[model samples]
Target: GAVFKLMKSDFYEREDMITLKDIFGTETLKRSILFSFQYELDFLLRQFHQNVENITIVGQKGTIMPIEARAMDATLAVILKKVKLIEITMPPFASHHTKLIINFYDNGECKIFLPSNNFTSMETNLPQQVCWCSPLLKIGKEGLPVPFKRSLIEYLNSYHLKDIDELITKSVEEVNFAPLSELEFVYSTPSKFQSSGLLSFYNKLEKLSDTAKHYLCQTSSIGTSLSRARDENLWTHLMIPLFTGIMSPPILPTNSLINEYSQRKIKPYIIFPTEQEFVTSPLKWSSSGWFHFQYLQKKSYYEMLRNKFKVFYKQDPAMVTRRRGTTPAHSKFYMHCATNSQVFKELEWCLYTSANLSQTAWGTVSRKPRNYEAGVLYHSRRLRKVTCRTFTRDPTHVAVPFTLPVIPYDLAEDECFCL
Candidate 1:
């Protein structure tokens, strides 16, 4: 219930502690979050047609899938009005001339990779016991990226160009006829749906400028998107960001953050508040100060109370004498700064508030001829911890603001990235 505020001066100081837990405060008291990989698969099965426009899978040689043939047959048959599947077995590797296929749409994009991990029943069967279960892993630089890209395009361009080779042309309707190698797999059983999309994707590939196309291919080799590119190259560009090999899945780099700090590389950039300063009101309206605040203290006090209570409870009717701010006994949670764009790139100081982009909060608040919300910003987290400790350690001051000062830095050093 306690609102941990941030202060300008203490915002970027090295956190006294190094743990993210210390910076965030009350690690055990916060609500837990649920990740959704299980949910994603379930949704894909039942509502795959609705949510996903297309799907593609590439597996390694000798991969074994224990899926019931009946279920596999039924599911793949109707799941997509359009679908493509490829399985590569041992063959002469063609790493020479391959164009990665990627389809970028306004909604999302997918990159088809040439390499992939061998798919196994274990991928869907075992959960916790399996660590390296990802089929994508098998398709590393040594595997499929180039082969699939080159093979699929040739297979697709044939039907689009209406020039299937004699082997596939003559055996189109032969159910038992199979290609001799993985390189010719699609030719053995090419479908009309796959043919069209593949043909168009190839055409799109040729349109990208050489420099941009080269960038994707070159970046694909060394980045997080490589495994993805191998799996989805036939359909679209990888549906993943090319993270610069730092963090793992579900924590991709924020583009907005990168854009914000592109100008400065070494210097720390701080985001100053660009809005009006907000303050809480005391119960009694009288003040004794030797400053301009006293000149309008009476009127300013009433206005402050009105604004504070209004925002706290909105414009509706609410009790006046009732304390608006949380008491010291209330639970304390450190207010976290949002992942600002500037901080991501420049690794600069970052801050966020309900205030919008403006001048007063940042500029005027900086000069602070008088100290204002700085106390709230800096002491908010400390106050909560101090009060919590007071309530637990010193029962006599259970309800009073503890005499001990609050910690200066809300976040610990490790809470943010250094590089």
Candidate 2:
């Protein structure tokens, strides 16, 4: 039943979660490829066992930079020598924000980490993130090859980048994937995704349910569109498709960006930290840069979407997981359900991903896309009687990123503040 585990954080606490220490803190670590938008080189290197032969860093500034002098002390100096920096080129307006890790152990097995946070101390506290860990994946299964494994290899092949393809050769040839056949490795690339058999995140989500009462979105940043007349518009274009599991093309005739409040049964809700809530939190204004909205500064967005706005308050049902503290909207999660009670009681499906509410991350209806992103979708029907927790256990339920029964924002006073 172990599918994915939430990132262990000091800002939030959980017993069953996965920590970097658990992976790199021991002798099994042999080699690793680290990918993220940001990294604390010194902090990253210190976590690895000295036995690690090679470490590769991908996707910060489109190219890895030298470890700044601040962390260049002797202890880190030696580790830096073992590190190899690689550069990735991106198209204009696109980014390499995919946070993933490929750790090759002493055995033939390798563990894949699709995280929301960078390889820095930022994850120690202040933000919430997730990592999907595979069981000890040995090479060769009894009968068939894992489809998810094929999907991952297809994703790697799609990279078409130097220093990347060869790294995944073994994972393709030898690893046994029969154990994780049901897990969907939803990914996004910069070019047109022509690969058949692989499913877009939208495609994977569309199977969940159509009659869901509430579509919930929680993230640090909301996507923006230059065209007021087209897709990329946050509500109709981004949220609606993300809600329905279809590629967004909502600016057409029927779905107008201006028409809201008419729909009664199905609704869209965004859970974010308010300014006042930030004022009372552990990090204060220091972490506000991460939570963003280009339209948030405008009262036009508030007047139209304020009713749909929600706040973060982790009220635990104590069934499986509990939020010990506040996570300042850093983790991105997409969820839907008919009811809104503690632990959400039930869910149609939940997507725990690196892609936020943006066209840049999750392109258009045509499969047009940019940004390298990865995540796994947890479906209630598949997980069967879902309970949000760390890994697959005796119970069938998969965990949701945030805690339950989120509180609504104060319509009278509290407002979405983007700094």
Candidate 3:
């Protein structure tokens, strides 16, 4: 009902949504009907998505889709009911800043790292608060909190719906299914003794290292987004901003060396949406993509962890009595300090942008991968496709083209552009 109503007011009343037979739309009644219908449909879909086990996508790089998540909330209610799901995401062109990690279950785990800079529309448009997290787990060969496997498995056995039906019922009302604001009530006893319980919970959270907390929130938020995408507005927006982090404009001259060797070309595509000419252009952008992974160096990493890392060790180890130039150790230290962490990854990938992957309150719309974008297409694909309207014949037309560029491959003792 409400959907029709909305369509009537926003489209029909304005003569934008004239019916096939040119019927005059009812303004108030149409709105109420459309809104009610949208609400009910959103509610039912949210209930149906409870069984989704995994999510995979191919989405554009830079767009918003918040309403979609609301619909998914009920559809995937089962998964969200207990928070036991594993997730993997490949974001484009910078690390995701959304609280995507908080939903990791005691019986499960999640791992996600993307190339995108920021993760929420709130980050760019609303300017919400952000946190700098510290690590929570000790890095070991066994993975995650080494002791959590046994203990948490026990916890899940007593709480999971498949394992404990009655417990599940009690938990949803008492602890598991309540809204975010009612958390304290859900976890508390209705007596005086537990009045200070929330404070204690927060203190324990504080004890967790910043990194651990950050990763936890990252995973959980992803689960929440998946769950919420089925109910509220059916989708929401997840936005990313440029001009931050180590996103240096690719060094054109240096990157050109490998492009020349590989016999390819490159160009840049700068699309400013608010600009007048771009508005009328027939071009339609779909999405963007990104890729990232860890690189383990063969060098002894723990030695520095155990020793005094402050000493200069790059080039010269000591200062000379006589006037002398900086030693190799100090020079190396300076170099490392100057370089960005993105450059240090030494990976074989490029990040790109689009408009599919997104952050949310609730509802899932398209069967497509939510808001997303592509970041890497070595050479100059975006440039060739994105052209300037004004300077059609200008000889020096600027372009960010795609090309083979620098293909870094690590050899036995060093890295290389060509094997």
Candidate 4:
């Protein structure tokens, strides 16, 4: 049993499965706020059509306003008139990279939607993605969930913008968000000190029992690949202690240094694209290092990194008769699951996030983090014993389960020459 459910469109149909459009059509829904890294006018128009009168959009890095104006469609213009757009200005290369939607209902209830896809058409309709929905919550006597409300407020406050700050205060005063039993929100603000949510995540991982075994990380990018690989900060300082409880001393990775972790049996698995996989992917041109070389590195870079940890390749599954080319893996997910012989295959924790593996994304103790990243860390409270898994279905009105597949790299069948 897996803790994650698949969401696919190529197969049959999932008539019963919930979607953004379905949720937006609720009669009680009055207002909504969307936080997205990118935007697509057509997708927004399709999902929202007078279902919600008042709408606010928080766009990343102040990039969507111009795109909104250029849409030029009459319906889009009409819709834009009612939508308020706010840009979370960032310093230099950083971005406001969180995807979320909060809906306020007339019946004093709020619904939260966290989707892995952005508002772009390519992300929403063309690619494989995930959407996590929170049940409708009533704003009753009890205060909003303690750490969640606090985390949201704290992240919003980091923006230091007037409108966002006011929104946070208003939500705190009005909405009594119900408590979530086993979930924690991890967020990153541009803090001058060591305030990135990765620090918090590291702290949490430190407390995990030995049952916490495998570390699976799947992401679209792996930070400043070539340069970061050489830097010991990400691996020696951060990953070592977090994964194996072995604090690596601040020294160059000599034979002795590698020997310690190798003996400790702390090898984390990273799933990423290889040279052949990207060339054959659905969007070959969109692959890393195509237009911008500095953004992501070549396959050999990851192969070089294989010395420190395990790297795997994604195996896309085809569920439909029609040919849907490879679905580029864009959703960032990290999980810690049990390793030993376990019947249920227990999951220690899972993080659905926008933050990739980067010093800028996670930040270091000495400097401020570059990006404004956000994610929710999920833990099951109801299941002390019950098996918990995630669901994935097809794009049609009716659909069924789809499995996510991957294979670890075998050095014997591979080639790694570059440093």
Q: Number of clashing pairs, model 4? A: 19
Write candidate 1's Cα lDDT for 142-203 as tens digits.
22233333444454343332322332222222211111111111111123233322223223
Q: Give the clash count for each candidate.
A: 32, 5, 149, 19
Mind giving the per-residue lDDT tens digits that candidate 2 earns over 1-419?
A: 34566667665462356778887777888878777877777767878777788887777464444577865787677667888776777777787777877777876776776666777776545555666666566656436656567667776667676567765455455677766766667777775544321236555555644243667777777766625643234545445644543434343332442233234345666777666755654556656667777664455544546543222232222422334334354667776676525434566677667777777777665445677777666677664544554221213345545555566665777666567
Whole-model lDDT, model 1: 0.20
TM-score of each: 0.18, 0.82, 0.18, 0.79
lDDT (0 to 1) per candidate: 0.20, 0.61, 0.18, 0.56
**Candidate 2 Cα lDDT to native:** 0.61
Give me the overall lDDT of model 4: 0.56
Ranked by lDDT from best down, the candidates are: 2, 4, 1, 3
lDDT for each residue of candidate 4 in 1-419, tens digit (9 for 90 to 100): 11233334423232234456765667678888888888775566556655567778888654573444455677566666678877666677787778877888887888777676677655554445666666556666764355666677777777777888675446644666554434566778785543565666676555543443456666655664414345343544465455565552223353444566467654455655554444554555442431111322455444445644544544433422223334444567676555442311355566778777677777754445678777777654422422333232132111112124345556565322111
Residue-level lDDT tens digits of model 3 in 19-90? 211111111111000000011222222322332342211112333233356456443454334332222233
User: How close is each model in CA RMSD to the real structure?
Assistant: 27.1, 4.6, 24.8, 5.2
Query: Hey, what RMSD does candidate 3 come out at?
Result: 24.8
